[PDB]
Write a protein that binds this ligand. Structure first.
Ligand SMILES: Nc1nc2c(ncn2[C@@H]2O[C@H](COP(=O)(O)OP(=O)(O)O)[C@@H](O)[C@H]2O)c(=O)[nH]1
Ligand SMILES: [Mg+2]
Length: 169
């Protein structure tokens, strides 16, 4: 069956693990060690296609930089997560965008921009500013809450659709 290798990246504390575990296990985790990096796999149906998602929940630095380069080269699509109450996490998106393109040595890399924690009242990044950044990259932007599940399926399924568009060229 078709497999899609997805990689979730973003600053520590933005909800990468919470988003991934909501997609896979359908519950919100209040506490998950920020240093744990692991992969999950789930069979889903997306637009009538039965497919396997293989998702890497990243945790930042690796023992050796060759490990980072390896998962970036093998990953097919990237979910670039910031938190709407953490401006620094939004500014760090520039770094992840650049680093992924550099390792892949490609200008066209399937990517979706995710603004997580949309259930919280505190917001430092308004939607407009994130839409402006996504428009500059030519990629979709989705606001999510790993707590309420709002937008979670859409974020991951939209990324799969971006991969499919990249592949048909
Ligand atoms: N309220 C709220 N809290 C969240 C959300 N996503 C993650 N969190 C919390 O934010 C903290 C960090 O999330 P985590 O998934 O560990 O972030 P990671 O470092 O990117 O993996 C945890 O305390 C989670 O409970 C969300 O959508 N809403
Ligand atoms: Mg984590």
């Amino acid at each position: 069956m078709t497999e899609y290798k997805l990689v979730v990246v973003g600053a520590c504390g933005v909800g990468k693990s919470a988003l991934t575990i909501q997609l896979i296990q359908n519950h919100f985790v209040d506490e998950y060690d920020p240093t744990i990096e692991d992969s999950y796999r789930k069979q889903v149906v997306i637009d009538g296609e039965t497919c396997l998602l293989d998702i890497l929940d990243t945790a930042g630095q690796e023992e050796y930089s060759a490990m980072r380069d390896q998962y970036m080269r093998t990953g097919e699509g990237f979910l670039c997560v910031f938190a709407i109450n953490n401006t620094k996490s939004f500014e760090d998106i520039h770094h992840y965008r650049e680093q992924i393109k550099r390792v892949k040595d490609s200008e066209d890399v399937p990517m979706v921009l995710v603004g997580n924690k949309c259930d919280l009242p505190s917001r430092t990044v308004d939607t407009k500013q994130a839409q402006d950044l996504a428009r500059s990259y030519g990629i979709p932007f989705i606001e999510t809450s790993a707590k309420t599940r709002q937008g979670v399926d859409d974020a991951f399924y939209t990324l799969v659709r971006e991969i499919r568009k990249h592949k048909e060229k």
